[PDB]
Amino acid sequence: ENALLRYLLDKDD
Amino acid sequence: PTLVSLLEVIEPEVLYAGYDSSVPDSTWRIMTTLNMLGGRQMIAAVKWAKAIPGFRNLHLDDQMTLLQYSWMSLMAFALGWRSYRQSSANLLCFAPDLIINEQRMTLPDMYDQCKHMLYVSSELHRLQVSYEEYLCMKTLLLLSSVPKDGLKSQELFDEIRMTYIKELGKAIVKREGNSSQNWQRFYQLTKLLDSMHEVVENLLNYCFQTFLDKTMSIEFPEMLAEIITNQIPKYSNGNIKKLLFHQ
Numbered sequence: 109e110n111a112l113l114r115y116l117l118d119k120d121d
Numbered sequence: 122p123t124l125v126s127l128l129e130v131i132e133p134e135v136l137y138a139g140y141d142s143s144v145p146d147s148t149w150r151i152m153t154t155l156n157m158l159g160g161r162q163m164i165a166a167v168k169w170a171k172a173i174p175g176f177r178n179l180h181l182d183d184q185m186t187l188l189q190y191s192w193m194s195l196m197a198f199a200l201g202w203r204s205y206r207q208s209s210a211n212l213l214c215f216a217p218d219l220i221i222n223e224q225r226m227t228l229p230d231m232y233d234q235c236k237h238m239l240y241v242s243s244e245l246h247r248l249q250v251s252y253e254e255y256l257c258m259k260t261l262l263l264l265s266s267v268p269k270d271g272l273k274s275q276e277l278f279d280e281i282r283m284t285y286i287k288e289l290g291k292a293i294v295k296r297e298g299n300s301s302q303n304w305q306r307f308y309q310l311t312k313l314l315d316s317m318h319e320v321v322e323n324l325l326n327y328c329f330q331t332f333l334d335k336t337m338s339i340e341f342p343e344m345l346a347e348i349i350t351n352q353i354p355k356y357s358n359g360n361i362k363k364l365l366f367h368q
């Protein structure tokens with residue numbers, strides 16, 4: 109649930 | 122480095138729609154392109170939020186919560202500013218290659234959604250909103266709604282939101298007006314922030330219907346489908362506390 113958003117917040121930019 | 126300057130440097134780049142102007146317009150074509158472009162705007166909005174001072178200090182769940190509630194508020198407001206700066210007319214500057222003008226506005230059902238976006242750019246133009254006031258206001262829109270039972274880091278959130286409310290006050294004082302004019306401007310700009318809840322409610326009513334009715338064949342990219350899928354049950358369970366400056 110909300111896989112993409114959690115990935116974008118957790119990855120290093 | 123001042124706080125407002127840290128909000129300024131993280132302003133997202135201008136994205137292009139990839140809209141082929143050689144093929145004629147249609148509402149379905151424009152709406153589909155704008156939804157695809159909106160997904161890319163929302164991916165850029167996560168990168169943006171992560172660089173807002175204090176945002177990363179909130180619980181990861183609160184970071185997800187705030188972006189999911191505020192997504193359309195951020196987009197409508199960023200679009201309003203972009204439109205206010207680039208045209209001064211009844212024009213929506215979604216992308217340099219995809220501008221919604223009067224001719225495009227007459228397309229079936231185009232206006233019923235676009236008018237809510239036009240209200241935003243109209244109000245920024247009417248209030249002569251400055252760049253620094255706009256940056257503070259946009260960060261405040263990210264912090265404009267919380268869950269019914271609050272955030273995991275509610276105490277820290279209330280401190281961060283107060284900091285950005287004080288930032289808005291500092292941007293207002295720079296307009297070199299008197300104490301009475303400053304208080305009037307604070308009232309006017311926070312009234313516009315309050316009204317963004319209604320702007321978004323109208324946008325989401327149409328957006329939620331379009332997403333749910335699969336017979337319309339209106340595609341949403343993964344980023345938007347995921348936010349809408351998350352948000353629809355939150356609204357039906359009354360799981361939303363809309364923060365207001367005025368009563």
Ligand SMILES: C[C@H](NC(=O)C(F)(F)F)[C@H](Oc1ccc2c(cnn2-c2ccc(F)cc2)c1)c1ccccc1
Nearest residue numbers: 152155158159162196199200203214215234327328331
């Ligand atoms: C998800 C929405 N779709 C629907 O409501 C519909 F119509 F499909 F149901 C879509 O939402 C947006 C909102 C802002 C957008 C985009 C794409 N880019 N931008 C944008 C451009 C410049 C900025 F500065 C900021 C954001 C999509 C929209 C499409 C058409 C009319 C109104 C809204």
